[PDB]
Write an enzyme that holds these catalytic residues in place. Structure first.
Site, PDB file in Angstrom:
ATOM      1  N   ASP A 137      -9.129  -5.768  12.506  1.00  0.00           N
ATOM      2  CA  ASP A 137      -8.878  -4.332  12.455  1.00  0.00           C
ATOM      3  C   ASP A 137      -8.334  -3.991  11.073  1.00  0.00           C
ATOM      4  OD1 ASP A 137      -8.520  -1.687  13.280  1.00  0.00           O
ATOM      5  OD2 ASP A 137      -6.514  -2.055  14.059  1.00  0.00           O
ATOM      6  N   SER A 138      -9.240  -3.869  10.104  1.00  0.00           N
ATOM      7  CA  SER A 138      -8.896  -3.861   8.678  1.00  0.00           C
ATOM      8  C   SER A 138      -8.629  -2.487   8.068  1.00  0.00           C
ATOM      9  CB  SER A 138     -10.016  -4.544   7.881  1.00  0.00           C
ATOM     10  OG  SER A 138     -11.220  -3.792   7.954  1.00  0.00           O
ATOM     11  N   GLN A 187       0.809  -1.215   0.000  1.00  0.00           N
ATOM     12  CA  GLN A 187       0.000   0.000   0.000  1.00  0.00           C
ATOM     13  C   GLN A 187       0.839   1.261   0.000  1.00  0.00           C
ATOM     14  OE1 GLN A 187      -2.427  -0.720   3.437  1.00  0.00           O
ATOM     15  NE2 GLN A 187      -0.679  -1.584   4.569  1.00  0.00           N
ATOM     16  N   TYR A 210     -13.220   9.568  10.980  1.00  0.00           N
ATOM     17  CA  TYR A 210     -13.723   8.561  10.052  1.00  0.00           C
ATOM     18  C   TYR A 210     -14.918   9.162   9.310  1.00  0.00           C
ATOM     19  CZ  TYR A 210     -10.741   4.778  11.779  1.00  0.00           C
ATOM     20  OH  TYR A 210      -9.653   3.980  12.095  1.00  0.00           O
ATOM     21  N   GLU A 225      -0.450  -9.393  10.764  1.00  0.00           N
ATOM     22  CA  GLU A 225      -0.436  -8.152   9.999  1.00  0.00           C
ATOM     23  C   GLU A 225       0.331  -8.391   8.715  1.00  0.00           C
ATOM     24  OE1 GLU A 225      -1.196  -4.571   9.992  1.00  0.00           O
ATOM     25  OE2 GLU A 225      -0.281  -4.911   8.019  1.00  0.00           O
ATOM     26  N   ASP A 267      -1.046 -12.586   5.261  1.00  0.00           N
ATOM     27  CA  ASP A 267      -2.436 -12.264   4.946  1.00  0.00           C
ATOM     28  C   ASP A 267      -3.361 -12.986   5.919  1.00  0.00           C
ATOM     29  OD1 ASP A 267      -4.932 -11.692   3.936  1.00  0.00           O
ATOM     30  OD2 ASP A 267      -4.700 -12.800   2.065  1.00  0.00           O
ATOM     31  N   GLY A 268      -4.191 -12.215   6.619  1.00  0.00           N
ATOM     32  CA  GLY A 268      -5.078 -12.767   7.624  1.00  0.00           C
ATOM     33  C   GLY A 268      -6.079 -13.796   7.114  1.00  0.00           C
ATOM     34  N   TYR A 303     -12.038   4.265  18.716  1.00  0.00           N
ATOM     35  CA  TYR A 303     -12.122   3.047  17.899  1.00  0.00           C
ATOM     36  C   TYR A 303     -11.315   1.898  18.506  1.00  0.00           C
ATOM     37  CZ  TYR A 303     -11.235  -0.081  13.873  1.00  0.00           C
ATOM     38  OH  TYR A 303     -11.089  -1.178  13.050  1.00  0.00           O
ATOM     39  N   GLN A 304     -10.091   2.201  18.927  1.00  0.00           N
ATOM     40  CA  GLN A 304      -9.210   1.182  19.503  1.00  0.00           C
ATOM     41  C   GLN A 304      -9.836   0.557  20.756  1.00  0.00           C
ATOM     42  OE1 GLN A 304      -6.798   1.096  16.498  1.00  0.00           O
ATOM     43  NE2 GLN A 304      -7.373   3.138  17.246  1.00  0.00           N
TER      44      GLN A 304
END
Ligand SMILES: NCCCSC[C@H]1O[C@@H](n2cnc3c(N)ncnc32)[C@H](O)[C@@H]1O
Ligand SMILES: NCCCSC[C@H]1O[C@@H](n2cnc3c(N)ncnc32)[C@H](O)[C@@H]1O
Lengths: 282, 282
Positions: free
Chosen positions: B159-160, B35, B223, B110, B141-142, B65-66
């Site tokens: 947590d995407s 990314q 957000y 992660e 990759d999860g 959020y966390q």
């Protein structure tokens, strides 16, 4: 004004951040005696009303603020019959208030006749409030209007913005206390807890010195800075419990009133604050 | 990217609207295997982490959020001892999870090592999670990681771009398999002001896999639309997500240094505006 198809909202009261809304069509842009009035059709929020460069409402999300500011105080009063609205030129708050059968009369004091004219044309969904037979419309500054009244209203709602300056004087709250009946309640726009927690704390300490019951609530709304806004609630009735509605609405009523945000559980939850805010106020 | 001192966030998933944050200093701007990674110091939100042009966290508001994504599932489980986190490169979710005494082990999968390196430098308040002794860090990759596990975790949190594999419908089934017999999970669950249609579908799909499904939300200025939701599923048919099976005392909230979450917030988080309550329950 509009830059490259987008209207961006900036203000020193929320520095370093900004919401922009993509514009499809400029509809209106004139200066009244009091404020700069700008209306546009946005790409995804319907019609948008901007006053002195601050977004004051959009057709897509106005129902949350309008319904909450009206129903928070009205459902916290056992029998609200006479109601005063300060500001609320677009008609939306009136719209929500008149849905209550107990309400016989609603007085509205709005300072700018032009806001009223623009809303009637460009915000018909809100301005439908003006068709109510319960309405007594009054033009003028709400601060001065409040001095004319004593022991007159069950509920007062301030739907403010500039010209809203007179409404941020500290005697305004005392003037409101006077205008209210002995067990009256009031509801005012009360700052965003993510932006001005310091000010909410002060306002609350000041109100508590005037009223036996004071509370703070909030609702979500994408197009107000930080995506939410708060309400200050005060009662002259020491037994008022703002957190648990004295007038719970049945599902039938919610449906009949065509509510899209408010209900009795939303009412209760609106007073449940994030820990940082609960700590600060308590 | 940054234009005239401001970074503006646009995405087709929220057309016609945009948040901009004023920039004080560009800190970092590199493409990893996966990314585009952009970090800046903003004027009023502290450090800001942007991935593929989407704001993923700021130092000023990440705690909401966390804390919610971690505590919503953890306090809805009677004894969470083994926990899996998918994504969460910045370390923040890990930070919140390890505060729980019952948690002995936390595995984190992660995909991008570089996100981990950038956060350690530019998000130290979040990356402090990595100092926990309970951590087993896994790179990968999860989606593929989930296939390696069966009857292994009490709680899984997601947590995407690269998160694409995480939006395949078998991922939920993969998660169900990896969970213990009474396990629970929590995933980022769409904004009810932006994608109510998608929340309705996701909920119908999950209900077909799990005996207990719920939706909750929290506020967070940065957000889109100022809030985000959570999808919660349990394989335990007696789980009541709305009333925490593990209520926290005020002592605990203080000890854990929570700034958003508490047991009343937990309960209120499931109370939705009427339009969303109607859509998910009618
Ligand atoms: N509906 C969402 C937001 C309300 S917009 C604020 C409204 O309050 C009016 N207004 C401003 N100052 C005022 C004053 N001092 N007295 C009476 N009205 C006033 C102003 O004309 C506008 O119609
Ligand atoms: N904290 C607020 C928001 C979280 S940001 C999303 C995080 O999840 C990671 N990530 C993305 N796709 C992934 C995948 N398929 N597998 C594992 N991790 C992934 C990505 O590298 C980033 O660290």
């Amino acid at each position: 004004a509009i830059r490259e198809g987008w209207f961006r909202e900036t203000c020193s009261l929320w520095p370093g951040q900004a919401l922009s809304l993509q514009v499809e069509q400029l509809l209106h842009h004139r200066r009244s005696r009091y404020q700069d009035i700008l209306v546009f059709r946005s790409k995804t929020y319907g019609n948008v009303l901007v006053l002195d460069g601050v977004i004051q409402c959009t057709e897509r999300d106005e129902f949350s603020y309008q319904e909450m500011i009206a129903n928070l105080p009205l459902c916290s009063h056992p029998n609200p019959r006479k109601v005063l609205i300060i500001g609320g030129g677009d008609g939306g708050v009136l719209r929500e208030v008149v849905k209550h059968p107990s309400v016989e009369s609603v007085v509205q004091c709005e300072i700018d006749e032009d806001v009223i004219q623009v809303s009637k044309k460009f915000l018909p969904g809100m301005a439908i409030g003006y068709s109510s037979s319960k309405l007594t419309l009054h033009v003028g500054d709400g601060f001065e209007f409040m001095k004319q009244n004593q022991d007159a209203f069950d509920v007062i709602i301030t739907d403010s913005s500039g010209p809203a300056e007179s409404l941020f004087k500290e005697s305004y709250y005392q003037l409101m206390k006077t205008a209210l009946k002995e067990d009256g309640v009031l509801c005012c726009q009360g700052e965003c807890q993510w932006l001005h927690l310091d000010l909410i704390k002060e306002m609350r300490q000041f109100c508590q010195s005037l009223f036996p019951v004071v509370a703070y609530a909030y609702c979500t709304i994408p197009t107000y800075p930080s995506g939410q806004i708060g309400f200050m609630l005060c009662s002259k009735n020491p037994s008022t419990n703002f957190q648990e509605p004295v007038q719970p609405l049945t599902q039938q009523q919610v449906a009949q009133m065509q509510l899209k945000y408010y209900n009795s559980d939303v009412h209760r939850a609106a007073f449940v604050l994030p820990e940082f805010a609960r700590k600060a106020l308590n």
